[PDB]
Amino acid sequence: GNSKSGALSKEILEELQLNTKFTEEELSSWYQSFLKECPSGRITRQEFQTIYSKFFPEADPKAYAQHVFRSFDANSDGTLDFKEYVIALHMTSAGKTNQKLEWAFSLYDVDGNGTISKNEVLEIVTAIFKMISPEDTKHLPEDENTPEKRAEKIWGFFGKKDDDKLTEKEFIEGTLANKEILRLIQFE
Numbered sequence: 001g002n003s004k005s006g007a008l009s010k011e012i013l014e015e016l017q018l019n020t021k022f023t024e025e026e027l028s029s030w031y032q033s034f035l036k037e038c039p040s041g042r043i044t045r046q047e048f049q050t051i052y053s054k055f056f057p058e059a060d061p062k063a064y065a066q067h068v069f070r071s072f073d074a075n076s077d078g079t080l081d082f083k084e085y086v087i088a089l090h091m092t093s094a095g096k097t098n099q100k101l102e103w104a105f106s107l108y109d110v111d112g113n114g115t116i117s118k119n120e121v122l123e124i125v126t127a128i129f130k131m132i133s134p135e136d137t138k139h140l141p142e143d144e145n146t147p148e149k150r151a152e153k154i155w156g157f158f159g160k161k162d163d164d165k166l167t168e169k170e171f172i173e174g175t176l177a178n179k180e181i182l183r184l185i186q187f188e
């Protein structure tokens with residue numbers, strides 16, 4: 001919902017292994033306009049490959065993300081959510097903390113007030129848990145059985161209020177201050 005959030009994505013999707021040149025401003029107009037035209041975020045293969053190709057030229061249409069697309073695995077009309085695919089992409093690439101956070105909170109801060117609800121947290125945790133294959137999921141600890149018990153706990157951690165709201169700072173200071181949340185929000 002803002003060019004700023006585009007920057008955070010630049011450095012992130014940049015160190016990953018690709019190399020997008022489009023400044024953060026471009027992703028801003030493209031992102032919104034992209035989800036604005038689509039229904040809610042459902043895209044097809046013929047379309048995704050085109051986005052990953054332009055976003056990352058020197059990287060081969062099958063370098064890293066090649067696996068991600070597999071994890072999701074379509075299952076209806078041959079389409080898949082894009083927003084989730086993105087968040088998943090970013091969250092898990094393995095990197096600093098506040099980097100993926102401030103980006104996640106800003107990503108949900110579309111254009112209205114300036115806060116995020118529990119249901120939103122769950123959506124994210126669902127994006128990563130799904131990003132994981134039912135095979136590597138058996139290795140995860142027991143305190144992560146499902147995005148439901150994992151999101152609820154996180155909420156009872158920095159939320160301090162059942163079904164409440166988190167502000168930009170709160171969210172950040174919530175993961176940085178408490179190590180648990182940080183380990184319950186940033187992938188493993």
Ligand SMILES: *C(=O)CCCCCCCCCCCCC
Nearest residue numbers: 001002005006009027031052086
């Ligand atoms: C508000 O306008 C949020 C804008 C965020 C833009 C960065 C996300 C767009 C890049 C997604 C990467 C997809 C790789 C195929």
